Amino acid sequence: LDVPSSSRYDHRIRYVTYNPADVVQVDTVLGVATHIMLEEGEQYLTHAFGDSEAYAFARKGRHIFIKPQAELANTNLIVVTDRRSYKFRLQMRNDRNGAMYELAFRYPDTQARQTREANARAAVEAAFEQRVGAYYNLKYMMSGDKDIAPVNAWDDGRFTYFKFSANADLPSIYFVDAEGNESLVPRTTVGSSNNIIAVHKVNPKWMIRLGNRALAIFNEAYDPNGVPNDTGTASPAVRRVNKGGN
Amino acid sequence: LDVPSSSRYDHRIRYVTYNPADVVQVDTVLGVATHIMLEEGEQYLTHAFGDSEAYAFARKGRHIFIKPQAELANTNLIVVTDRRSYKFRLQMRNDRNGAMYELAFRYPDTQARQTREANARAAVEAAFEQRVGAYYNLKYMMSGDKDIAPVNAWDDGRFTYFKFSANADLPSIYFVDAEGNESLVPRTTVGSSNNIIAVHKVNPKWMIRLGNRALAIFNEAYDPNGVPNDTGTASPAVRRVNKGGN
Amino acid sequence: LTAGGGGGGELAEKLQPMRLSGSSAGRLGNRDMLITQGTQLDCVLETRLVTTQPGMTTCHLTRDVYSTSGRVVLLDRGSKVVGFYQGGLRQGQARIFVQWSRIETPSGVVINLDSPGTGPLGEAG
Amino acid sequence: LTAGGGGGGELAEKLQPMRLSGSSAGRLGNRDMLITQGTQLDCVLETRLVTTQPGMTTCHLTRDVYSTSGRVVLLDRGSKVVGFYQGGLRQGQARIFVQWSRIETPSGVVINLDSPGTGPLGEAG
Amino acid sequence: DRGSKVVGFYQGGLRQGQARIFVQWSRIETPSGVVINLDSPGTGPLGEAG
Amino acid sequence: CASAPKPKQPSDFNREPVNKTVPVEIQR
């Protein structure tokens, strides 16, 4: 028999932690409405009263209001939703003291969850901003149009970066195979001033185009080996785990 | 219990800061009106009474109205809405004194946010006008149909300005690429008398056209590096934040 | 819980007047954070384009597209724009009309514009 | 056992206004678990393609598909993509249009993407 | 104010023999933010239609 | 007999290193 525990401002607000194998004691005092609040998005199925007429019931979504309406209101409520089955022991109090106005069901499992992913997200963001333990290549040569010339180009072994000054237009970046044909690669833009365009590969030969001006970039320190990406992310500090289960 | 404080102006108007974990001690009297104001845009879900008949309930949106209509009307009001829940201990005062007319709760977060935004706007609407610490170029050649020629042209490193006299038409200004192709550039008219046309770029060669007379502008001190746009605005003193959050 | 004559029809109708309604000037909401019709987006095309089958396009902006007041950067350079066409061509036509459904920014701002695509100088298609 | 006026029609009609609805900027929910429109999935074809009869295709990716934030692998290289085509060609055409149905990461991720197949350079069909 | 911007559309193309195109205009934007949506046909340098 | 023009193929003579200076975000 779980006893609701009151808040430290008033005794009329009480909290109770759920239990599948225990019923809830509610001492209903005369003349008050009691608010029972379900889980967010709890789907209502059915109730059951020890006396339909000793108590007045009204529901909206996950909200319940109960009120004494007959003498000697001492019965039980078994309200069942999709997820569980609440059990309330409705005992009417005689001296109309010690009312409850809302009852709360904190679920320790759900609170434990909510705490977890917040800490996890903080850790993930911290790990990403750590960005330590990498090598950087700068053996890059360029040929052709220099008016689309990036100011710096490099690679961290997984991504290739180009940097353009403030006054130039950001061109399109193209991937060259060994044969000489071009093709598409996904690109993303990063930086304080969006002046770095990053592509998702390291390749010996890059081609840059803008209208009818074409520029070629040679990666002259190509690493066929590269660093394998076991962690499943852009940084070796974070894994990628399967939530979906099944 | 949360017992409000009367206004220094009048005792009939009382304020108390909303706290979900407490009840509101409301002392109604006979023959007076009580006004309850929700937070703006609060969608009413349901309410409940310790007595459906002791008081009378009137709602127009977020305005709630409760009057006694029977003696010994000491019950509780639980109006739950989308945003929060309210608990009033309707205790009737028999001496026809200490009447209350309105209760409006304090939502500290909302008012707190609203206080700061005005400060931000006021500061911004002066930071823009500050506008100090920029380098002005003045090396500009012109050639072509000289009748259209602006009286003064210069650039700040981010925007290029053209000033036309009051007696001249405002021509169309075009951005030139390397090969000589002409392309559009967004433009904005500024200045006290709309005699200054500003373009959103800096470039070596500008082409000015009007009707069928065309003038060419060559920049003689074009800087590839420029000044980076790390603030995200026209100013180095105003930042742009992603308030959309999500 | 809860308590509760007209003859000469030809010159008649050619004299039928034509009335154009009035107009009133409005004002914009906040110029620092709006982009008006007719403002120029200058993106560089990524995907090569063939009109034999209906497909989609893709282009990246090349300039910070400032606000109508010319004070706030509302679309960062390198933003990414998706657009499509259809229907193919008809004889003699040497242009195709392409429509850009959605832009997407580096910082995650997504605004849904439905604008025509133009050549380097604004001509249709 | 159990219980229980209108005149000047042509000059008027050609002067009817075209009023275009405004648009508002939303925002993406999570830029790490989301692939924006227009991102390039660069797979390699498995089966030889003949358009004489309507059938299905199959291709496998060749690069890890990173999230738009560029921080998460969302589709492991070697993921399997099924697609199909139908109807054949009309005279003079030189490309057939294929729709991709589904992608499968070896780790059991299945997502239904419907997007148009493209050539090496993103050209339609 | 001079230097304001005006946006407008056209459609339909031409037919044989015609040598001008009828372009309508829809909106005008002042520098200081005044918008009024005049709907008036556009004219060449000497007012001829289209 | 006539087909799509190939895009401009850049000249292969002016081959220079791209990084005249060490890039900054490397913290170098």
Author numbering:
A (entry chain B), B (entry chain E): 21 to 266
C (entry chain A), D (entry chain n): 150 to 153, 177 to 297
E (entry chain D): 248 to 297
F (entry chain C): 17 to 44
Reported in the publication:
Conjugative type IV secretion systems (T4SS) mediate bacterial conjugation, a process that enables the unidirectional exchange of genetic materials between a donor and a recipient bacterial cell. Previously, we solved the cryo-electron microscopy (cryo-EM) structure of a conjugative T4SS. In this article, based on additional data, we present a more complete T4SS cryo-EM structure than that published earlier.
Further analysis employing 3D classification reveals a degree of heterogeneity in the positioning of the two extra TrwF/VirB9NTD-TrwE/VirB10NTD sub-complexes within the I-layer. We obtained three distinct OMCC structures, each characterised by a unique arrangement of the two extra sub-complexes in the I-layer. Aligning the structures of these three I-layer conformations using the O-layer as the reference underscores how the variability in the positions of the two extra I-layer complexes impacts the overall I-layer structure. Although the structure of each complex forming the I-layer do not change significantly (RMSD of 1.06 Å), a shift between corresponding complexes in the superposition of conformations A and B or A and C is observed. In both, this shift changes in magnitude, being maximal in the superposition involving the second extra sub-complex (that in orange in Fig. 2C i.e. complex 10 in the A versus B superposition and complex 11 in the A versus C superposition) and, intriguingly, being minimal in the complexes opposite (complex 2 in the A versus B superposition and complex 3 in the A versus C superposition). Thus, the insertion of extra complexes occurs at various positions in the I-layer, resulting in structural adjustments that propagate over the entire I-layer.
